[PDB]
Ligand binder design. Structure first.
Ligand SMILES: CNc1nc(Nc2cn(C)nc2C)c(C(N)=O)nc1-c1cncc2c1ncn2C
Length: 285
């Protein structure tokens, strides 16, 4: 039994608003019995949403589990709002972190990319394209563990239509074959997004972020679009530059899979562990 017809406040104390976007509004909350901290996400239900589809979406969240994806605990449906209870990730998103710390070290980025690649390899095996890989959608808990905030864009939830169309105002992390579809693309779009995210963690913004989103969207559709590169050449190793070159392969017919990317020297160098992130969180305190 799940998706209870009741106020989540009956079981949880709402402490503070953590943030939100097209995916919903997120709150810090505390289990009234055990005292454990959770994140409660509120998503408004649209008139064309149906609970038969909703039940199928929640079943995917319950069954599909991986160490690099934020765990689902349970859900509520109250006054046309779907409330999702999930694992609390105390440090917030990588964007919340780098806005305070500044750029991540190459080693710290290598660790984050290895963890995200593991989460992506899992989703792609379950035939799920994430389509929303970016620093704001990668969370860090108090143990320095890396978690994808969600499985990516929901295929059949009403509120997620705005998320599916969000690339119009924010196309910077999107693969060119996605922008230039207006025939097709596949799961390798998430590998390009990870490449852009790796530049974002290094430079505090994705490539061309200051260019109007509508101009970027059009530039990606044009023939001759050159994949971005790291700006400061002398700051990064040949292995990091090569990792960017490989993930940002323009043709998806030449771009490696999430599993293959795990064989890259950057993400298989020695000393990659959560201790690198605990050290990043030490700058915060
Ligand atoms: C605002 N989003 C989030 N915040 C969170 N916590 C947080 C944020 N801050 C600043 N500090 C804390 C402690 C947490 C969490 N699980 O702890 N989950 C999200 C979140 C949830 N679902 C989808 C998401 C999310 N994030 C992006 N997508 C696409």
């Amino acid at each position: 039994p799940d998706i209870f017809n009741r106020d989540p406040r009956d079981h949880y104390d709402l402490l503070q608003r953590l943030g939100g976007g097209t995916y919903g509004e997120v709150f810090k909350a505390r289990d009234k019995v055990s005292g454990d901290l959770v994140a409660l996400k509120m998503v408004k239900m649209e008139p064309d949403d149906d609970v038969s589809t909703l039940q199928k979406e929640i079943l995917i969240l319950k069954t599909c589990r991986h160490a690099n994806i934020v765990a689902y605990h349970g859900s509520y449906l109250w006054l046309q709002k779907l409330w999702i209870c999930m694992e609390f990730c105390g440090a917030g998103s990588l964007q919340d972190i780098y806005q305070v710390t500044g750029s991540l070290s190459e080693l710290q980025i290598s660790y984050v990319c290895r963890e995200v690649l593991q989460g992506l390899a899992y989703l792609h095996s379950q035939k799920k394209i994430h389509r929303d890989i970016k620093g704001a959608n990668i969370l860090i808990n108090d143990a320095g563990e890396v978690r994808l905030a969600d499985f990516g864009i929901s295929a059949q939830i009403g509120a997620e239509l705005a998320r599916r169309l969000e690339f119009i105002g924010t196309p910077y992390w999107m693969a060119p074959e996605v922008a230039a579809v207006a025939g097709g693309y596949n799961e390798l779009c998430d590998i390009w997004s990870l490449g852009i995210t790796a530049i974002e963690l290094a430079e505090l913004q994705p490539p061309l972020f200051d260019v109007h989103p509508l101009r970027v969207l059009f530039l990606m559709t044009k023939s001759g679009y050159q994949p971005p590169r790291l700006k400061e050449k002398g700051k990064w190793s040949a292995a990091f530059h090569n990792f960017i070159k490989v993930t940002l392969t323009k043709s998806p017919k030449k771009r490696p899979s999430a599993t293959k990317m795990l064989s890259h020297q950057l993400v298989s160098q020695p000393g990659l562990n959560r201790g690198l992130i605990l050290d990043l969180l030490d700058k915060l305190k």
